[PDB]
Each structure stands twice: as structure tokens, then as C-alpha cells.
Amino acid sequence: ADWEDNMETLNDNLKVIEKADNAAQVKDALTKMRAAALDAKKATPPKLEDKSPASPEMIDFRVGFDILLWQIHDALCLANEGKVKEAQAAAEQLKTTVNAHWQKYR
Amino acid sequence: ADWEDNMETLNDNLKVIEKADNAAQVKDALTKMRAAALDAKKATPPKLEDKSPASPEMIDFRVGFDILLWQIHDALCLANEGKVKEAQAAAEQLKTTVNAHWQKYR
Amino acid sequence: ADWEDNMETLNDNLKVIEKADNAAQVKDALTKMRAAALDAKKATPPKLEDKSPASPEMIDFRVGFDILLWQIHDALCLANEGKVKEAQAAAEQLKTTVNAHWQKYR
Ligand SMILES: [Bi+3]
Ligand SMILES: [Co+2]
Ligand code: NA
Structure with a gap:
């Protein structure tokens, strides 16, 4: 996977976070986001x-x-404890950073 | 602004954590410290x-x-659990690292 | 320490976590692992x-x-919440990543 594939993975897992209900889905999507971001770094x-x-x-x-x-980790800590809607609201701020980094370096 | 102003922000927020009264103030000061440490990096x-x-x-x-x-992260994770005293005690370790970086790189 | 000694510290603390009884030992070993990884950077x-x-x-x-x-951070946050067994399970997968990075660059 290249940098563009990692950006696409980040965006797809952000979609998953937006369309999530429980904390396990949020945790899995955030772990995928962390892996994709570390690969893109x-x-x-x-x-x-x-x-x-x-x-x-x-x-x-x-x-x-x-x-x-660090923003991914903030969302992951909100999801690890129990707050799901707070994790989604934090990931809303995460989508801005993701897409800004995507459009800045593409 | 520059590295020295980032170090001053770190010291000011360390003093704020020292004089903090609840977990919200500790978390705010630690978030500002995280931003300042990224800027200085x-x-x-x-x-x-x-x-x-x-x-x-x-x-x-x-x-x-x-x-x-990472030390700022540990302090912030201790603060998110409601442990204000333990967060301040961990921030005492932050002061030593900040002073060492100041004396080493100024 | 150099790269090999830092990897040795990582492996020793992984064994300590595997043969740990309480949460304080896991937290101490994870902090040592964090220091070792940061120094090996x-x-x-x-x-x-x-x-x-x-x-x-x-x-x-x-x-x-x-x-x-980041994997060490996940294990340490699991250990801070008293979830010693989840922390040990995350350390098990952490040993796989340590061994992969060792085989990659040795
Ligand atoms: Bi945490
Ligand atoms: Co954390
Ligand atoms: Na570099």
C-alpha cells in the first residue's frame, strides 16, 4: 500500500466511525486508522x-x-472507556486533519 | 513563534498544572503542552x-x-481517569525533561 | 544504549510482562519498553x-x-485500567512486532 492507499483507508475508516453504533466498531476502525497513518508516515x-x-x-x-x-489516540481513548458519541465527535475533528494532509501533499 | 516561545508555553502550562484545581484544567494545559511540543519538534x-x-x-x-x-500523553491519560493528584505528580517529571531540553538546546 | 541493547531491553520487559502478577509490574515494564523504543529511535x-x-x-x-x-501505549492504557490480562495479550502481539523489526534490520 502506498500513501494514497493509506489516505483512502483513513477516509473509509472515518466513514465507518461516522456510521458506528457500539465502541468495538469504533475501536477497530481507529486501530486501522493508526496502522494506515503509521504506514503513510x-x-x-x-x-x-x-x-x-x-x-x-x-x-x-x-x-x-x-x-x-495523537488525535487518533484521543478518539481511541474515548472509545476504550465507553463514550461512543464523544469518540465520533472527536473523529469529526480527525477527518479535517486527514483530508487536509491528503489534499496538501497529493 | 519559535522554539524559545514553545519552551515558555511548556513552562507556563506546567505551572498551571501545578496550580490546577480540577481535571479539566490539567487536561487543557496538557493539550496546550502537546501542541507546543509538536511545534518545538x-x-x-x-x-x-x-x-x-x-x-x-x-x-x-x-x-x-x-x-x-509521550510523557505529556501519560500525564493526560492519568488526568482523563480523574486522578488530578497523580497527573500533577507525573507533570513533575515533565518539568525535569523540559528543563533538561532547555539547558541542552538553548 | 545502541539498537541491540534496546531490543534486548524490550524482550526482557516483554518476558517480565508475560511472567507478571500485578498491574504495577506490567506498568513498570511497559514504561521501560517505551524508554527503550524512544532511545532506539x-x-x-x-x-x-x-x-x-x-x-x-x-x-x-x-x-x-x-x-x-503506539502498541506499548495501548498495552499501558489497558494496564492502567486494571486489565492486566488484556495488557499481557497485547504484549503477546507486541512481541511479534518486535521480532519482525529485529529480523528486518539485523
Ligand atoms: Bi488512555
Ligand atoms: Co493513551
Ligand atoms: Na528525520
């Missing part, structure tokens, strides 16, 4: 393929995934 | 301004701020 | 010494340690 996005891996652009690209993962 | 400290962004020194700098981020 | 495997510190191989190395850190 290793990749080079299409916009930065003309840059060296040592460029500051790639460093900022990798650091943005830290914010992404 | 995106920055270049004064001592390392003569090093390339991909030098081992800068990599170790970003890893040290990752350590700070 | 600054290390270089002997077969990648000639490579660039920001080369895609080293990027995959550090982000694999990020994956380890």
Missing part, C-alpha cells in the same frame, strides 16, 4: 517526490502524522 | 542552528521531543 | 551505518519504533 507523498528525504518538507510531513496519531 | 533550537535538518543532532532533538510528547 | 542498525540518517530505510526504522511505541 514512512512514505514519500507525490508532491514531495522531487525533494530529497533529508529536506525540511519531508520532516514537516512526518511531524504532521504525529498530530494525526 | 518542528523547529530548530539555537544550539543546533549550525546543523543540517537531517543531521543526527536534529534527529536526537526530535526524538527527545517525542519523549516529552 | 536514535540508534542505527549495523547494516544501515553507511546509509544516510534521513534515508528511507532509517525513516522506516524510526517509524517502526513509532509503531512499537
Whole structure:
């Protein structure tokens, strides 16, 4: 899977979170999101393929995934305890970050 | 703004956690600390301004701020469980790491 | 410590978690694992010494340690809630990821 596939996986699991009812579905979708984000952090996005891996652009690209993962973790902690609608509301803020990172580097 | 202002934000929110009264204030201060630590991880400290962004020194700098981020996460997870005193005790460890990073990279 | 010693610390604390009785031991071993993974993010495997510190191989190395850190976080959050057995089960899968990362870069 490339970076685009990871972005698509993030978006699909965000859809699953939006269409979720219990906390187990939310937990599974958030674990999938974390795995996809960690896989995409290793990749080079299409916009930065003309840059060296040592460029500051790639460093900022990798650091943005830290914010992404912290938001994923906030949602996952809201889901681990019991609050499902709160986890969905937190993932609503997560979709903004996901799609902004997607459209910024594609 | 810059790395020094991020360190000042970290110190101010550490003092806020020290003077905190409930879990909401601790969580807010720790979220602000997480944001400031990410911003500082995106920055270049004064001592390392003569090093390339991909030098081992800068990599170790970003890893040290990752350590700070994980300690902030532990404090925030302790705060989300309603343990305000334990969250503040964990934030006492944050103060040592912040002071060490300040003295090491200023 | 270098990469091999950090991996050894990870494996020792995994064995401690496997043969743990209470939650405090699991939490202490997981904190040691977190410290070891964070420190190993600054290390270089002997077969990648000639490579660039920001080369895609080293990027995959550090982000694999990020994956380890997030799994450690899941185990530690399970242990904080008293779920010692779920934490041990998550540590079982964590050992698989540790062994995969070991076989990949050794
Ligand atoms: Bi938690
Ligand atoms: Co957590
Ligand atoms: Na880097």
C-alpha cells in the first residue's frame, strides 16, 4: 500500500466511525486508522517526490502524522472507556486533519 | 513563534498544572503542552542552528521531543481517569525533561 | 544504549510482562519498553551505518519504533485500567512486532 492507499483507508475508516453504533466498531476502525497513518508516515507523498528525504518538507510531513496519531489516540481513548458519541465527535475533528494532509501533499 | 516561545508555553502550562484545581484544567494545559511540543519538534533550537535538518543532532532533538510528547500523553491519560493528584505528580517529571531540553538546546 | 541493547531491553520487559502478577509490574515494564523504543529511535542498525540518517530505510526504522511505541501505549492504557490480562495479550502481539523489526534490520 502506498500513501494514497493509506489516505483512502483513513477516509473509509472515518466513514465507518461516522456510521458506528457500539465502541468495538469504533475501536477497530481507529486501530486501522493508526496502522494506515503509521504506514503513510514512512512514505514519500507525490508532491514531495522531487525533494530529497533529508529536506525540511519531508520532516514537516512526518511531524504532521504525529498530530494525526495523537488525535487518533484521543478518539481511541474515548472509545476504550465507553463514550461512543464523544469518540465520533472527536473523529469529526480527525477527518479535517486527514483530508487536509491528503489534499496538501497529493 | 519559535522554539524559545514553545519552551515558555511548556513552562507556563506546567505551572498551571501545578496550580490546577480540577481535571479539566490539567487536561487543557496538557493539550496546550502537546501542541507546543509538536511545534518545538518542528523547529530548530539555537544550539543546533549550525546543523543540517537531517543531521543526527536534529534527529536526537526530535526524538527527545517525542519523549516529552509521550510523557505529556501519560500525564493526560492519568488526568482523563480523574486522578488530578497523580497527573500533577507525573507533570513533575515533565518539568525535569523540559528543563533538561532547555539547558541542552538553548 | 545502541539498537541491540534496546531490543534486548524490550524482550526482557516483554518476558517480565508475560511472567507478571500485578498491574504495577506490567506498568513498570511497559514504561521501560517505551524508554527503550524512544532511545532506539536514535540508534542505527549495523547494516544501515553507511546509509544516510534521513534515508528511507532509517525513516522506516524510526517509524517502526513509532509503531512499537503506539502498541506499548495501548498495552499501558489497558494496564492502567486494571486489565492486566488484556495488557499481557497485547504484549503477546507486541512481541511479534518486535521480532519482525529485529529480523528486518539485523
Ligand atoms: Bi488512555
Ligand atoms: Co493513551
Ligand atoms: Na528525520
